[PDB]
Design a protein around this ligand. Structure first.
Ligand SMILES: CCCCC[C@H](CC(=O)NO)C(=O)N[C@H](C(=O)N1CCC[C@H]1CO)C(C)C
Ligand SMILES: [Zn+2]
Length: 165
């Protein structure tokens, strides 16, 4: 099923996602619904908070053809270096707006696959940025919180106008 994606300034997007203790069927079903919604969007990633399910579950596919489905459950990453990188990020929950967000270049991801088995990895490029952009969703953050107050408000207003209109 294609799922509904909440948008700024929906306060629900500020909910802090709770840890997935077990990976039952209900969880895998959600995962699939999350992939579909993401492809349908279209986006290269999606966290459960964006669709009103507040569990630590991140879905991703950083490829052209839909051949690289990646699942990140109970994720967490660590900057292995003091290095930074500027990237113009957009978000399905902040549609139409794209701002250059500054984030660490090399991070070490740590999660549980679709089955719930721990795995560790080292991210760079698009994956690093993406898991960071997704782990923010689980904590209630949006790339727009790295933006100025006036710039972010100019955005909050536009959407609040678009939304109901
Ligand atoms: C970290 C990069 C963004 C994270 C993933 C988001 C989707 C999202 O809202 N995830 O929570 C996305 O697909 N964003 C797209 C985006 O910002 N892209 C697509 C890949 C390149 C980059 C724009 O230059 C836009 C077009 C919807
Ligand atoms: Zn997003």
């Amino acid at each position: 099923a294609i799922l509904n994606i909440l948008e700024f300034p929906d306060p629900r997007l500020r909910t802090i996602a709770k840890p997935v203790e077990v990976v039952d069927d209900a969880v895998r079903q959600l995962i699939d619904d999350m992939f579909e919604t993401m492809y349908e969007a279209p986006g290269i990633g999606l966290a459960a908070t964006q669709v009103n399910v507040h569990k630590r579950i991140v879905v991703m596919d950083l490829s052209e053809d839909k051949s690289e489905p990646r699942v990140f459950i109970n994720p967490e990453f660590e900057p292995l270096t003091e290095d930074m990188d500027q990237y113009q990020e957009g978000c399905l929950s902040v549609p139409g707006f794209y701002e250059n967000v500054d984030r660490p270049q090399k991070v070490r991801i740590k999660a549980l696959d679709r089955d719930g088995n721990p795995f560790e990895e080292v991210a760079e490029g698009l994956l690093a940025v993406c898991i960071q952009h997704e782990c923010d969703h689980l904590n209630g953050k949006l790339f727009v919180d790295y933006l100025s107050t006036l710039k972010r408000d100019r955005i909050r207003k536009k959407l609040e106008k678009q939304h109901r209109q």
